[PDB]
Structures are given as C-alpha cells and as structure tokens.
Ligand binder design. Structure first.
Ligand SMILES: Nc1ncnc2c1ncn2[C@@H]1O[C@H](COP(=O)(O)OP(=O)(O)O)[C@@H](O)[C@H]1O
Ligand SMILES: [Mg+2]
Length: 304
C-alpha cells in the first residue's frame, strides 16, 4: 500500500488518456456523465491487452481507480481472436471475464468516481465546476499537442442530450488542433513562435556569456496572441506549456512569458501554446537562464 492514488478527476482523466497514448492509439474518445461524477469512459483504438496480462492489469493508476470506483474494461489485442470484457472489484480483482466482440483497442469505464470514499465523493460533487474546469484544461492540453491523433469528448447531464466538450480531427499540425479546440477566431489573433539566439543585452541581464549560450539545445515552438491592443484574453485561462510534448507548469517560464507580454499589452494576458524540446537528461530544468534568455529575446523580436 504505497498509493499513487488518483487525487482528482483531471488526474484520473490524465492517467487514462496517457494509457491510450502509450498504447499507440490514433483515436481516443472520452465520454463523461454529469461531468465525470457518474461516468468517465475512455475509448481507444490501441494495441489493447493480451489475455496473459489481464490478471496483471491492476498489479499504478488502474489499481487506484478500481479502489476508488467500479471499473469495467473491454479489450482486444491484435493477436486476439475475440475481445474480452472485464469487471473488477475494489481490490483490483477480476470479478467477471467474458468473451466480447470489439475492434482492436481498449475501453475503460470508471463508474461513480470516489464512491468508496464518501467524504472525497461529496467534495467532488460540491466542487465539480472547478474540478471539471481543471480537467478541461488538461484535456485541451493533450488535444493541442497530440498531432495526428483524434481526441474527442462529450458530456451528458442526467438524461439530457450530449454536450460538446472538444473534438480534434487528427490533423498533423498543432496549429490545426488549436483551430479545432478553440475555433478559427482564436487562431487569427495568434502569431507563430520564432526563435532567436539570445541577445547580448538579454544575456547581460541573465548573467550569461558566449560560453553559456553556445550549447543551447532548447528548441521552442508554438503560438502566442499578438501584442495588439484588445486582441488578448482577460485571464490566463488559455495558456499551455509543454516540455518534450508533455503538459506541465513551468513556473518561471510562465511568469516570463506573461511579463514580456505585458510590456506591449499591460491590460491582458496572452493565449499561449509553447513546447520546449530538450534532452531528457537535462530535466526540472538545467540551463534555465539560457532558456529564459532565449524566450525573452525571441518574444521581444516578435512583438516589436
Ligand atoms: N488504454 C490502454 N491500452 C493498452 N494498454 C493499457 C491501457 N490501459 C492500461 N493498459 C496496460 O496496463 C498497464 C498498466 O496500466 P496502469 O496499471 O495504469 O500502469 P502504468 O502506470 O504502468 O501505465 C500498462 O503497462 C498497459 O500495458
Ligand atoms: Mg498509466
């Protein structure tokens, strides 16, 4: 018992979406009922699971989910002649296992999240608006960065009609996924990222010298709102950062990006999509000053 316990709806959805991604899926659907309170279903056309690894499925995030909800999983592996449907108890044990015809892939159903922990379950219901918004940001993050991957999601309140949450088209480019997620009006107020060697004045302010900026292995790419008056946003609600295609919250990078923006638009925060490509062994960050230097210089060049 050394839990990696799913603390939230957003992390439950993150863990789930990443499994699909690690499974080499190209189509990942996410169905939610009552904002996930009643149902969180992640469907994926992936490699699926082989039958000699069923019992091992919970032996990890899936084991925690089981403990915190009623999990049902149907799956089929390329090597499989027929799919399989599995029902797990709260100890991650397989209750039932029956042949089930389905295409290659996996479908994970998390029914009634947190029901085993009354207290956490009510907190979930009371806070729902924030919990859900936190998940949407996580979801959007993966939608934007997953290129060549159709990611869809719908929400259903009670017996009402299904509502739209998001739907990308498997476009091979980030720019297109942004269009899919926030629509074409957002795109028009954006300019692509243009990287520049850190400038002398900026290196000066970051205590950097030639030797410091020579082995710069930072490759930055993405989009940002123009510095044009009004074009921005009213809050930081649409700012996405990634380090090696993985959603994250670099603290310093975030402030820096906003401040450099406020220099040209004191009254608004920008829309931000920023991926930072780096050498894994250099990750927290190893040469931050260089990066911040690169960012500031590059942003300044784009905004003037
Ligand atoms: N959607 C999925 N598609 C394929 N395999 C999956 C999926 N979800 C879980 N798995 C399998 O279950 C294993 C464990 O998942 P999980 O228990 O959450 O652990 P881990 O945190 O190591 O991914 C993975 O290594 C993978 O083989
Ligand atoms: Mg996992």
């Amino acid at each position: 018992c050394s839990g990696q316990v799913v603390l939230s709806l957003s992390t439950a959805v993150k863990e789930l979406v990443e499994n699909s991604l690690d499974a080499g899926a190209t189509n990942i659907d996410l169905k939610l009922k009552d904002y996930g309170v009643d149902l969180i279903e992640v469907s994926d056309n992936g490699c699926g699971v082989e039958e000699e690894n069923f019992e091992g499925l919970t032996l990890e995030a899936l084991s925690s989910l089981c403990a915190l909800s009623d999990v049902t999983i149907s799956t089929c592996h390329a090597s499989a002649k027929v799919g399989t449907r599995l029902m797990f108890d709260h100890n991650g044990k397989i209750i039932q296992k029956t042949p089930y015809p389905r295409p290659r892939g996996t479908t994970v159903s998390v029914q009634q999240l947190f029901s085993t922990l009354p207290v956490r379950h009510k907190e979930f219901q009371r806070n729902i608006k924030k919990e859900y918004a936190k998940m949407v940001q996580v979801l959007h993050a993966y939608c934007i960065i997953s290129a060549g991957i159709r990611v869809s999601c719908t929400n259903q309140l009670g017996q009402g009609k299904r509502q739209p949450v998001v739907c990308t088209g498997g476009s091979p480019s980030i720019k297109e996924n942004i269009g899919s997620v926030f629509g074409q009006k957002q795109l028009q107020s954006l300019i692509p990222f243009v990287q520049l060697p850190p400038s002398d004045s900026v290196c000066e302010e970051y205590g950097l010298s030639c030797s410091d900026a020579l082995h710069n292995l930072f490759y930055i790419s993405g989009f940002i709102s123009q510095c044009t008056h009004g074009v921005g946003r009213s809050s930081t609600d649409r700012q996405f950062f990634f380090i090696n295609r993985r959603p994250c919250d670099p603290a310093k990078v975030c402030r820096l990006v906003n401040e450099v923006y406020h220099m040209y638009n004191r009254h608004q925060y920008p829309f931000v999509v920023l991926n930072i490509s780096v050498d894994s062994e250099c990750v927290l960050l190893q040469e931050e000053k260089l990066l911040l230097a690169v960012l500031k210089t590059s942003l300044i060049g784009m905004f003037d």
